[PDB]
Structure 1
Amino acid sequence: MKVRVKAPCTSANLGVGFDVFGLCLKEPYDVIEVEAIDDKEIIIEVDDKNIPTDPDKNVAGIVAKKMIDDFNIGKGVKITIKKGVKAGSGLGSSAASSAGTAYAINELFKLNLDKLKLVDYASYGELASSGAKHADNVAPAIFGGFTMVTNYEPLEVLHIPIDFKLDILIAIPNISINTKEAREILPKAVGLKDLVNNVGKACGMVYALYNKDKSLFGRYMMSDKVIEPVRGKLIPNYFKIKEEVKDKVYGITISGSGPSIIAFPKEEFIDEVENILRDYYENTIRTEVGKGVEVV
């Protein structure tokens, strides 16, 4: 009685969509196995030893218990986790485990819950663990494609399938940013003009997706002046890299809280951009939009 799942990384904010937008990646991902066991206990194992194994501290254990309790499940579970990427990289690492666990529990115990509810449960875990739902990483991990968290409580998620091709390049710097550090960078207030600018550009990106227009999507994506200029200072060579790939990408910005960089290379310069990225960051991967947590 077990289930094995692939839970993908995700890239949130996407420039002008801070705390709303989320794009699901195909790679990297967490591989998670959940096994029903007879004694009413929650046991966790993770291939990354610094990660707590205490079911009350590990986001995966926190999600399992809440679901086990809510659905008055008899069994306990053994959760085995192979991490795709370290937390603090801006790639929704913790969200992958939260989403992956909610989705795996739903499968193993036949709960038949719809996706929005799985996002809710996964978010319960992120909240308990870090003080915030991080629904904008959890939603794309569960739905796949592009998502928008358009109300935080009650939680509402709008999903926009991405059916055209969208190559993605991810540069992963060897530094980290935890949830506390991410908030420190945030501006205290925003000028009316910036709100207007961001609302307009963010809405234009939605229009761009429905019109399959990658240039428009990427161009508007690079317009934020509220957060990006400050968040970008935290990433070595970010602005310089942005300048150097300028005409070879549809768009490039910071992934989530950073420090990872996400770029959408034009088809003709994909290897060149990958190479340029590698020259600054050895840990660079090539992916595409993902379909969300899937049974493997």
Structure 2
Amino acid sequence: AIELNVGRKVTVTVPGSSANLGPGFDTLGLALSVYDTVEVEIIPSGLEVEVFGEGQGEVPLDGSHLVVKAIRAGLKAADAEVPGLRVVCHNNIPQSRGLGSSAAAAVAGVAAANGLADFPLTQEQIVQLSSAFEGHPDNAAASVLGGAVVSWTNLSIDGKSQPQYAAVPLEVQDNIRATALVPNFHASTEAVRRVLPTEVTHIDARFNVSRVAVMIVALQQRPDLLWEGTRDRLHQPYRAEVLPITSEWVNRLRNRGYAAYLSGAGPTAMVLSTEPIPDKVLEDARESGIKVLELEVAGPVKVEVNQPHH
């Protein structure tokens, strides 16, 4: 293993992301313009980790351990080692709201480690390493690649064998935007997959196959089809049971023609459009205690090298 020098420092800016996008359960992801910023500096000894981003008076954020584990895993894959690390995080991605906070933290750490080692790893390797941690693969890929992505896993059966995680970028039309409606409750709990059935009808499976295909063309060239492409029968009807309020916001929005869907497993409802959502709709959400984020589709994780080369 090559030893990296004291003073080497990078600054990683990683976007959050939204998964599923309606019918694209465990496969589609969309990077969003809300960011965690992770500075990593090689120091002579010790591990120093700082995490900031919570409101005044509130309890400290999560993910510091996740960023560290990801940095370690990246350094290993880069065949590099360090005598010491200082890690400083400014996290703006809302956590446990279905906006890809954990996945982004893993991506930041792998990408930081890669930058520190002068970038020996490929994008494909970064997607592999970051996806293996806590956050889902469709989120991690979005945070790495930017834009909209298709992701998939090959469960290697010879034998253990960690799964392959792969992803490819979609083209997104430049005028598509994303508006998040983020409720307060840290719920949903991990009982949103205990609600997913073991069996579905062939007809419903068929339905999702065609609507995910429609969603992909909607994203790339037909934003008038976003409403059709965000229909789902594989996960949202079941999760609606657990998130009755989020479901009412999605239904209300969809009934008015908005391409609304459940962000990941919730409770955030996301709306994709080419025009801004009307003020009255957004202020109604805000008065109800729902945070409104008027976001852009984000580009890829960015790694800036702070320490000059000589």
Question: Quick check: TM above 0.5?
Answer: yes
1:103 to 101, 111, 136: 111
Find the counterpart in structure 1 of residue 19 from structure 2.
Answer: 12
Q: Quote the RMSD (CA, aligned, Å).
A: 2.3
Report sequence identity in percent: 27
Larger radius of gyration between Structure 1 and Structure 2: 2
Secondary structure of 1:183 counterpart: coil
Instruction: Give the letter for the 2:180 counterpart.
Output: I
Measured after TM superposition, the shift of residue 173 of structure 1 is 1.0
Q: Summarize the alignment of residues 87-236 of structure 1 with structure 2, pairs less than 5 Å apart.
A: 87-126=95-134, 134-152=136-154, 153-177=163-187, 180-210=190-220, 212-221=221-230, 223-236=231-244
1:122-171 alpha-carbon deviations (Å, 9 max, x no partner): 12332xxxxxx611100000100101113343222121132411121111
| Aligned residue pair count | 282
Q: Give yes or no for contact 2:70–2:110 (8 Å, CA) kept in 1.
A: yes
Q: Give yes or no for contact 1:36–1:77 (8 Å, CA) kept in 2.
A: yes
1:17-37 alpha-carbon deviations (Å, 9 max, x no partner): 11000001012x111111112
Secondary structure of 1:175 counterpart: coil
Change (3 A) 1:52 1:26: closer
Query: Unpaired runs of 5+ in structure 2?
Result: 1-7, 55-59, 155-162, 305-310
Q: Give yes or no for contact 1:60–1:125 (8 Å, CA) kept in 2.
A: no
Secondary structure of 2:190 counterpart: helix
Q: Give yes or no for contact 1:249–1:265 (8 Å, CA) kept in 2.
A: no
TM-score, normalisation: structure 1: 0.86
1:84-103 alpha-carbon deviations (Å, 9 max, x no partner): 13421110111111111111
Measured after TM superposition, the shift of residue 289 of structure 1 is 0.6
Query: Unpaired runs of 5+ in structure 1?
Result: 127-132
1:184-206 alpha-carbon deviations (Å, 9 max, x no partner): 23222222111111011111112
Measured after TM superposition, the shift of residue 287 of structure 1 is 0.5
Change (3 A) 1:227 1:6: same
Find the counterpart in structure 2 of residue 130 from structure 1.
Answer: none
Instruction: Give the letter for the 1:185 counterpart.
Output: V
Measured after TM superposition, the shift of residue 265 of structure 1 is 4.1
1:239-271 alpha-carbon deviations (Å, 9 max, x no partner): 432343336554001100101110124526443
Change (3 A) 1:271 1:112: farther
Q: Give yes or no for contact 1:248–1:273 (8 Å, CA) kept in 2.
A: no
Secondary structure of 1:51 counterpart: coil
Change (3 A) 1:269 1:78: closer
Distance 1:109 1:280 in 2: 48
Q: Give yes or no for contact 1:177–1:257 (8 Å, CA) kept in 2.
A: no
Distance 1:236 1:279 in 2: 18
Find the counterpart in structure 1 of residue 62 from structure 2.
Answer: 51
Change (3 A) 1:179 1:293: farther
Q: Give yes or no for contact 1:249–1:264 (8 Å, CA) kept in 2.
A: no
1:208-229 alpha-carbon deviations (Å, 9 max, x no partner): 233x1112133221x2122112
Q: Give yes or no for contact 1:248–1:265 (8 Å, CA) kept in 2.
A: no
Find the counterpart in structure 1 of residue 89 from structure 2.
Answer: 81
When structure 1 is superposed on structure 2, of 188-197 and 268-277 the one drifting more is: 268-277
Find the counterpart in structure 1 of residue 36 from structure 2.
Answer: 30
